Amino acid sequence: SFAGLKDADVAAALAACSAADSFKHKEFFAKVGLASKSLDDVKKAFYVIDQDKSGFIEEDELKLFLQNFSPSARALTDAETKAFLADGDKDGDGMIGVDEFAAMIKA
Ligand SMILES: [Ca+2]
Ligand SMILES: [Ca+2]
Ligand SMILES: [N+]
Numbered sequence: 001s002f003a004g005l006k007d008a009d010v011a012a013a014l015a016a017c018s019a020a021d022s023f024k025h026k027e028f029f030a031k032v033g034l035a036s037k038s039l040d041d042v043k044k045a046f047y048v049i050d051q052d053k054s055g056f057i058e059e060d061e062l063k064l065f066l067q068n069f070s071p072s073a074r075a076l077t078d079a080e081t082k083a084f085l086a087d088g089d090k091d092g093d094g095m096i097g098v099d100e101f102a103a104m105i106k107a
Helices: 007-016 025-032 039-049 059-063 078-088 098-105
Strands: none
Touching (some): 007 025, 025 098, 039 098, 059 078, 078 098
């Protein structure tokens, strides 16, 4: 709801990644409906996920990614989380900032 996503698109993408190590960020984004929202909307999203309002998604917030979308969802695994940063952390700081986030949702 925070980023204008359908209960339904969210239910379907969580299903697709219900198994540990099955999460693929690119796919999730597209299936949740994220990849077709406006940049404003991509920005609201970044802001909820960054729970502490640090202006960065820290690897502990990343671990809880899916929980943002649905409270009963599973935590991401270490290899899931590693792969996320690996492709989104472009400056090498170990965090995903707003610009790095939008960049990964884009394509
Ligand atoms: Ca944060
Ligand atoms: Ca970074
Ligand atoms: N954090």
